[PDB]
Amino acid sequence: MASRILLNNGAKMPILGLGTWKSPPGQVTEAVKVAIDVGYRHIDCAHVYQNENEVGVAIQEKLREQVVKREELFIVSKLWCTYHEKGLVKGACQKTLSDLKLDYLDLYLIHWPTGFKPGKEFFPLDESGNVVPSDTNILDTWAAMEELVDEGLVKAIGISNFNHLQVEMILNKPGLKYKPAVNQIECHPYLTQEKLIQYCQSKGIVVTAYSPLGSPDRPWAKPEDPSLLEDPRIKAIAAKHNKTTAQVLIRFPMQRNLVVIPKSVTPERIAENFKVFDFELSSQDMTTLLSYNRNWRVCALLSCTSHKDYPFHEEF
Ligand SMILES: NC(=O)c1ccc[n+]([C@@H]2O[C@H](COP(=O)([O-])OP(=O)(O)OC[C@H]3O[C@@H](n4cnc5c(N)ncnc54)[C@H](OP(=O)(O)O)[C@@H]3O)[C@@H](O)[C@H]2O)c1
Numbered sequence: 001m002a003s004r005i006l007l008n009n010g011a012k013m014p015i016l017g018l019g020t021w022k023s024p025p026g027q028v029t030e031a032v033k034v035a036i037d038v039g040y041r042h043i044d045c046a047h048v049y050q051n052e053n054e055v056g057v058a059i060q061e062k063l064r065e066q067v068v069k070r071e072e073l074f075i076v077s078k079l080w081c082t083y084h085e086k087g088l089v090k091g092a093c094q095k096t097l098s099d100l101k102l103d104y105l106d107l108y109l110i111h112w113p114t115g116f117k118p119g120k121e122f123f124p125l126d127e128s129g130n131v132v133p134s135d136t137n138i139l140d141t142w143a144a145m146e147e148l149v150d151e152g153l154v155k156a157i158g159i160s161n162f163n164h165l166q167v168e169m170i171l172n173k174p175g176l177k178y179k180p181a182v183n184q185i186e187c188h189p190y191l192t193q194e195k196l197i198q199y200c201q202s203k204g205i206v207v208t209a210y211s212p213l214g215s216p217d218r219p220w221a222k223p224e225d226p227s228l229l230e231d232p233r234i235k236a237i238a239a240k241h242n243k244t245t246a247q248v249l250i251r252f253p254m255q256r257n258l259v260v261i262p263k264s265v266t267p268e269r270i271a272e273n274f275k276v277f278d279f280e281l282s283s284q285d286m287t288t289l290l291s292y293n294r295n296w297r298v299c300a301l302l303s304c305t306s307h308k309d310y311p312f313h314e315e316f
């Protein structure tokens with residue numbers, strides 16, 4: 001298993017990264033320090049996670065300790081939905097860079113295709129609980145992202161939570177300057193994404209799988225929801241390999257030529273989750289895990305189902 005995948009800008013992206021959504025600010029600095037100590041070189045960030053300063057502290061410390069140099073790290077962040085207007089994009093990127101204490105990002109993603117009304121609130125609501133959209137569109141936001149590459153703020157740009165038609169809209173954009181390098185999407189045995197992965201990979205777009213463990217800490221979880229980490233069928237595959245269920249769930253997307261970004265703030269789990277380069281899932285294991293698909297999302301952006309750019313009405 002080579003540890004990096006080649007992107008369209010010529011750069012190599014580590015296939016295993018550390019996720020940081022729901023990593024509380026008071027716990028995430030140590031998590032990122034441990035991750036770097038045990039070998040992670042890719043960190044998945046976002047302004048909306050409200051913890052980029054604390055991520056940046058950890059990175060700074062490890063640079064100053066001589067543990068890693070900047071060129072070996074692969075730092076990803078994402079443009080939040082309230083900043084899709086072309087005149088807001090650069091400032092949003094520069095705020096992430098300032099918080100992270102970096103002079104460039106390796107990859108910057110449009111976090112969701114949906115633009116929201118600009119303002120302080122991340123999910124601005126009217127008086128009936130509907131997300132207030134903005135008058136923004138994918139193509140104009142993409143053009144603003146391209147400017148970030150041309151100014152040296154980011155090495156590559158990509159998208160997240162885009163369906164294949166939304167990806168196609170960018171690919172077919174008149175005067176396209178940069179193709180998306182990555183589409184970061186939810187992917188796990190209950191939502192295997194066969195059609196969207198096939199589409200993206202056929203267009204030379206690398207796919208990153210988010211919520212690979214099923215996001216058991218997501219804030220809207222219901223007790224009756226399916227649970228990957230507790231699935232006895234996956235536990236049995238793990239036992240046969242003398243690995244944990246989480247390790248199987250991380251190895252799975254790696255064998256599909258995906259990047260994967262499991263999140264933890266628990267030092268033992270951070271180290272456990274990286275120890276996935278010493279075993280292989282069999283053809284039968286892969287087939288079996290793919291067979292668990294139920295088209296089941298844990299991140300369905302349910303407050304935005306009437307937005308013009310809501311991504312999940314399309315089959316893929
Ligand atoms: N682009 C998007 O729209 C989007 C959406 C969702 C997620 N993401 C990215 O993807 C990352 C991963 O997804 P996620 O955070 O939703 O969830 P996840 O990585 O599927 O699961 C994280 C949860 O699993 C626990 N965990 C981690 N390792 C474990 C292990 N070895 N054994 C048992 N439990 C374990 C964590 O607990 P502790 O942390 O308490 O150890 C946490 O509760 C995010 O953090 C974010 O960076 C992006």
Ligand SMILES: COc1ccc(-c2nc3ccc(F)cc3c3c(=O)n(CC(=O)O)c(C)nc23)cc1
Binds near residue numbers: 048303
């Ligand atoms: C009812 O429909 C819903 C409910 C909740 C979320 C959600 N809310 C957030 C609120 C504040 C915040 F900082 C991040 C959120 C976030 C957030 O950061 N993520 C993670 C992501 O988008 O990467 C996700 C997936 N969702 C939220 C979204 C839609």
